[PDB]
């Protein structure tokens, strides 16, 4: 895969055009801490090393163990981890929308 | 006529006082540079 881990990001160019430096110095953390989640994203692919079962068949007198381990490896698939922060982020987004609407109204006034 | 002299002199001195009281130049040099820093941007969530 490596789609939404290795080869994707968020455009920081429009992010730096609004932040008033010392007012939003946590953006310096946000561009850096998320970069840590990009740095571990440089590692950690889906399949880091495919198993050459033919090599183990040639290197073992009895290849039935190799076939059994290949069948067990194909029979097990790990799914995506569970999430419980989506509702919290949606609540923060809704509160942000309300505060932005209030701030826009005050700016209009 | 010292009484009328005294009353007219003091009425004139008070009249000069209220002429000077309105002799000033109202300088409207109230700069509005404070509004260049009154606006505060909306705080985000971190």
From Swiss-Prot, chain B:
Its main location: mitochondrion. GO terms for biological process: ATP biosynthetic process; proton transmembrane transport. Keywords: ATP synthesis, CF(0), Hydrogen ion transport, Ion transport, Membrane, Mitochondrion, Transmembrane, Transmembrane helix, Transport. It comes from the Eukaryota. F-type ATPases have 2 components, CF(1) - the catalytic core - and CF(0) - the membrane proton channel. Belongs to the ATPase protein 8 family. Mitochondrial membrane ATP synthase (F(1)F(0) ATP synthase or Complex V) produces ATP from ADP in the presence of a proton gradient across the membrane which is generated by electron transport complexes of the respiratory chain. F-type ATPases consist of two structural domains, F(1) - containing the extramembraneous catalytic core and F(0) - containing the membrane proton channel, linked together by a central stalk and a peripheral stalk. During catalysis, ATP synthesis in the catalytic domain of F(1) is coupled via a rotary mechanism of the central stalk subunits to proton translocation. The gene is MT-ATP8. This is ATP synthase protein 8. It comes from Artemia franciscana (Brine shrimp). The keyword Transmembrane applies. It is a single-pass membrane protein.
């Amino acid at each position: 895969a490596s789609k939404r881990i290795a080869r994707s990001s968020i455009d920081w160019a429009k992010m730096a055009e609004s932040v008033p430096e010392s007012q939003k110095a946590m953006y310096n953390q946000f561009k850096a801490k998320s970069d840590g989640y990009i740095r571990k994203a440089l590692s950690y692919p889906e399949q880091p090393s495919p198993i050459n079962w033919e090599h183990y068949r040639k290197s073992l007198t009895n290849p039935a163990m190799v076939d059994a381990f290949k069948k067990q490896y194909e029979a097990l698939k790990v799914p995506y981890p569970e999430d419980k922060v989506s509702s919290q982020i949606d609540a923060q987004e809704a509160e942000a929308k309300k505060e932005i609407t209030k701030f826009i109204q005050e700016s209009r006034g | 006529p010292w009484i009328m002299v005294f009353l007219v002199s003091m009425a004139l001195l008070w009249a000069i006082m209220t002429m000077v009281f309105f002799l000033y130049q109202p300088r409207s040099v109230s700069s509005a540079k404070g509004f260049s820093d009154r606006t505060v941007y909306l705080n985000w969530k971190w």
